[PDB]
Structure formats: C-alpha cells, structure tokens
C-alpha cells in the first residue's frame, strides 16, 4: 500500500538553477528521499573539466607573457572554472587562438560541433598589446569527483573538477487537492553549472541509489 | 546545537542604579573628606569596601 | 579583503615597500604582468629632459622566510592616476589595503 | 548599529539561524551563530615537521 | 588509570562530553511527549529518533 | 570509472541471538555509509508493516486512573504488558481476543484462548498477577494491522501499537581499506527485533521498500 513518486513538474527558471517536484509522497519517504537524493546528487555526478592546457612560449605557471595582463596562474584558475559539456567523447582538445587588444572570452574557441560552450561571457584573460598573440591548446576530459594534479616541459596540469552541481536544496511539505491527506510533496530545488540535466541528474542519481541497494535486497 | 552569542550574555537591570548609589556613596564620602572629617587613608578604605 | 577591518590597512600597504606607488600622476600608458608605463602629465614634468615613468614589477622571487613575493598589476588602460595612488598589489595587498 | 546593519538585510538580529544536519538529515535543536570570520593561515605546517 | 601522587583518575571526561551529558539529562516541565509510559530504554531510543 | 561504483563484497553476520544480529558491509564508497545507514534506519523505525494490541476492554475497569481488586499491580503496568506482546496475525483484518483466568499464578502468554488464525510468537510473556483465589480477571484485547508507531495522544484504555516488528537499530560507519584506495567506509548494522519476523528479512523488507519507489526513475 505504498504510492509511488513521479516527475510532474520541471521548471527550468535559469540555465543554472532549476526545480523539481515529485508529488505523490507518503509521510516520512520524502525527508529520506530527498536526503539521500541530495547526498548522492552532492557526492559524485560525471562531468568535464579542464586538466591540461599547454601555452606556446610558456614553461612554467610560475611565468608571465609579453602581452597579457593576468599571469599564467590567473589564467589556469580562470580556465579551472570554465564549463564545458561534451556530447558523446571521452577526450577533446580544444584550440584558443586570439590576437589584439581585447578581453579574451570563451566564444573565442575554435570548437568542432561535438563540444558546446555553454557560457561564453566566462573572460579567459586580456591582451593590452596589439602585437601580442595566444595559442594555448586546451585539454577536456571526462571523469567523476575532485581529481588534483598531485595524485613535456611545456605541459601544465591544472586540478580538475568533475562537480556540474553546486548548490542542493530539497523542501518537503504537505500535498494537493487529492483526498488522501497524509501525502507530502517534495520540492528539490538545484543549483548547477548549466552543463547537466537535472532530470537526468535525478534519474542518474536514483539509479546509484538502486544499485547500491541492490546489496541489501541481494543480502 | 549549542552557540555563544550577544544575547546569551545578559545585562542585569539594576546594574545602573546599583552604580548610581556607588557613585553617590563616592561623592558624599569624597564631601566629608573635603571637610576634614577623615583622613585619607580611611577615606581609601570606605571607597574599597 | 577582510570584511570586517580597522582602517589601518592602507597606511600598512602604503608605508611599507611591498606595492608599487606612483611618483607622478598622469595617464596609464601600457600595462603589462612585468611592467607598468605611466604617461606624465605636463603639469609635473620637467622643463628639461621630459620623460615618462616605468615600473619594473617584482615576480616570483624567494623572501627571507622561503616564501614568494609577487606584485600584480591593478590598473587599466587609459586610466588616470593621482601622486600617492599605488600601481600595482604586492604580497597579502589588495588594491592598497592588507589582506593577510 | 549590527542590529540596523542587520535589518537592512533578509538577516536576523540575532545572528543564529536553524542549521540541518548533512550526514542524517535532522535539524538541530538550537539556532546555532553562521556568519563570517576573517582567518589565517600561520607559518607552522605539518610538512616541515613530520 | 589513576594517579600515583594522590590516588584521583586521571580519565575524567573534558567539556565537549560532560556538554553534552548534561544536555541529554534535563528536564523541562512541558515538552513533546511528556506523561507517557514507556517499558524501557529501547522504546526511549525509539522515541527519540 | 565514471559511472561505475564499488560493490560490498565483504558481508560477515554476527548472530548474538535469535533476535539480535550484526550485519557488516565492506566495502562502500566515500560518504555511502550514511545514505545508506540513515535511509534503512528511518524506514524501520517509522515505516513497517505489522500487527500489535491497539484498545482492551475490562468490565471491572471503567477508568485509565483507578485501581483493581485481586491483582498484585494496578492496571498502566497491565497496559505496559499488554505493549509487549507481539502478536502474529494473518491476512484477517482484525480480530478479537478475551483472556479468563480464575486462580492464582502468572497470568502468561497462554491462557489466551486460540479463537482465529493468530499466533503468539512468546507464550511464556507474563500480563498480571492474581492474589486471591475468589478473584478474576477478563479483558477484551483488541489488535490492528498498521504501520509505524502510533502515540495515545494521537487518537476505553489507550495502548500504544508498536506496528515496527524491531525495537532498536543503531548504525555506525567505520573506515575500510583498499591496496589502491583509502578513502572509504564500512558500514555496521546492529538490530533487534521482537521475535515475530528474522532481522535478516527485516533488512531485506526495508531494502524492497525503499527499492519500490525508485522504480519509476530507474
């Protein structure tokens, strides 16, 4: 005698943050699911960051360029936080190459069709020089969790960041117009990068949830 | 859950009158050392107590 | 930054020899990671020799403690600057106070 | 004059909100102090003395 | 366990446990659940959680 | 490696009697022991299907504070007792029960009659005393099929309905160890029950329930 969540609304206000409700919830199933929704969402989801970007000229991030502002470890922490979404690739290498005077932003990458750049506002660095010239070759792979750089000559590592969510939050509290009054609704309200579902953050998580129990059921 | 904070350290009500009477007590003790009445080292003992 | 400070950070990042304070206002001129060009206006030059200003930013260098020292630019292209405004944000600076 | 700082804000005056657990998921039965503090971080670290 | 110079533990328990031991044996005269019966600890643990 | 997680392979049972076991998985990912230990914990203790003694009726007893002539104890320490008796039920709804007793000695778990398809997992489970041999004593017990715990205040005698065939679960995560990996966890379940159901299929009862409801993401 135990009814069964659904997904009956979605709403998507922004490209970062988004709402979830799941509206048919007994008393008590909806602060654990929602718990364990928000440990599995906040614990580990696959996503794409930066690791390596390679600098032509550059030997170090201890260093500096003829022509840039920022520094090559402000260029490394700025590229650390790029979200970058990849559709059906392990590995990609993007390629940056940009000269002038001007802010140089992530629409500046000469990208194939494969990879999208889901925020182009995202400033790299800028070039106070109109001699100067970057060509940086900028490597996107795809892993689960926080992997640093401790665990060429030219080759820089930086320390990557699979984590698209950033902010979780559930609420649950008591139900519609339907007849049955000790139903609870919960509401999860998300706060991502842009580069995830969160339909299918929440089908991937209740998928882990499954398969983990699977142990228990086994026994 | 437990947490200090600026409203946990309470200020007793009749701290302010209490330091109004000490005050007085310094002033009329101070008035009847003007005149002559005690010596200082006496005057300094009642201030203490 | 500290949020919640004193008032006494500037006098600290100023008196002390860690940032970059300009000798002459004037104009910025070029702005690089290394160095910093700075335009004089008229006002301050000399009747003879006029010239312009250049500070050579010190990088990545090893202190008496073993730790690095660094200077990094704060200002822009085209920007007017005063007698007495820093230039450029040494080690524990940020844009003239202390941050530690 | 924290307390006007503080209702110029969606803040409390008392400066203690209800904080949930993250391992089980339960509130806390007092507001406990959130707010900011301004730390450092000294020249004693473990790697030069193990 | 004890001490050789007068014979006291040197086991006593620091702040953050007699904190909270002291948190957890109190009363207040009207609370949630107050003037039931229980048979035993295990129902309290129970109820509790 | 991106989708694929480690899978408990080390699962040793601790049999401390036939009621009280201790299950160890090992080993789990970083912070799986809490999500699991927490989400199992909640649905045993508030969400279990079950049948327990909900209203008794006594002709002699018309009020919850009065006191009864030929028992040793007065009548909240019968209820306590009454509280106790875990009782299995069959798919019957509910049924009800009468106790008669005229003599003296322990009033168990057997002198209660075999009226219906009802079985009592503890009949050595004492209820009251008699003192006096001209006394009696007939009560009208009536259980419940329900979920959960259920209060007095919530809702003649009151007794409260222990529905959760457990009575104690207390989990704790430990620390586990691989050649290649360290940060992991190990999670312990320690449960008891009240005799009517294994701990064991508890476990797996709490598992399928909590396993239902994802059925429409995964």
């Not at chain 1, 360029?65 to 090559?72: F, L, P, R, T």
């Not at chain 1, 609420?171 to 117009?177: C, P």
């Not at chain 3, 002390?16 to 160095?35: C, P």
Request: contains cysteine; aromatic residues 4%; glycine residues 8%.
């Amino acid at each position: 005698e135990f009814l069964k969540p659904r997904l009956v609304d979605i709403e998507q206000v922004s490209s970062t943050h988004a709402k979830v409700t799941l509206e048919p919830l007994e008393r008590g199933f909806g602060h654990t699911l929602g718990n364990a929704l928000r440990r599995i969402l906040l614990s580990s989801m696959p996503g794409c960051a930066v690791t390596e970007v390679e600098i032509d000229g550059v030997l170090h991030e201890y260093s500096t360029k003829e022509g840039v502002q920022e520094d090559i470890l402000e260029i490394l922490l700025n590229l650390k936080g790029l979200a970058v979404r990849v559709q059906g690739k392990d590995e990609v290498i993007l390629t940056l190459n940009k000269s002038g005077i001007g802010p140089v932003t992530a629409a500046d990458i000469t990208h194939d069709g494969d990879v999208e750049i889901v925020k182009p506002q995202h400033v790299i660095c800028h070039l106070t020089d109109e001699n100067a010239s970057i060509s940086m070759r900028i490597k996107v792979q795809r892993g689960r969790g926080y992997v640093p750089a401790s665990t060429p000559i030219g080759r820089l590592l930086v320390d990557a960041c699979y984590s698209p969510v950033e902010r979780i939050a559930y609420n649950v509290e008591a139900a519609r117009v339907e007849q049955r009054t000790d139903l609870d609704k919960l509401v999860i309200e998300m706060e991502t990068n842009g580069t995830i579902d969160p339909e299918e953050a929440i089908r991937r998580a209740a998928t882990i949830l499954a398969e983990q129990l699977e142990a228990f059921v086994d026994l | 859950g437990a947490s200090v904070g600026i409203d946990d350290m309470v200020i007793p009500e009749k701290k302010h009158e209490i330091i109004s009477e000490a005050e007085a007590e310094v002033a009329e003790i101070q008035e009847q050392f003007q005149s002559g009445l005690v010596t200082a080292g006496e005057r300094y003992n009642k201030v203490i107590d | 930054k500290p949020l919640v400070g004193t008032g006494m950070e500037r006098a600290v990042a100023v008196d002390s020899g860690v940032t970059a304070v300009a000798k002459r206002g004037g104009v910025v001129q070029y702005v690089d990671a290394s160095r910093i060009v700075i335009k004089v206006n008229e006002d301050e030059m000399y009747p003879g020799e006029a010239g312009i200003d250049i500070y050579n930013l010190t990088k990545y260098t090893r202190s008496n403690q073993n730790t690095c020292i660094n200077q990094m630019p704060c200002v822009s292209l085209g920007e007017p600057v005063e007698r007495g405004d820093v230039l450029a944000d040494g080690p524990s600076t940020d844009l003239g106070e202390l941050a530690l | 004059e924290i307390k006007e700082l503080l209702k110029l804000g969606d803040l409390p005056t008392s400066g203690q909100i209800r904080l949930y657990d993250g391992r089980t998921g339960e509130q806390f039965e007092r507001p406990v102090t959130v707010g900011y503090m301004y730390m450092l971080k000294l020249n004693h670290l473990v790697d030069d003395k193990m | 366990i004890l001490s050789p110079a007068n014979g006291e533990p040197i086991i006593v328990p620091s702040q953050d446990v007699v904190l909270g031991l002291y948190y957890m044996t109190r009363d207040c005269v009207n609370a949630k659940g107050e003037g039931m019966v229980l048979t035993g600890p295990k129902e309290a643990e129970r109820l509790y959680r």
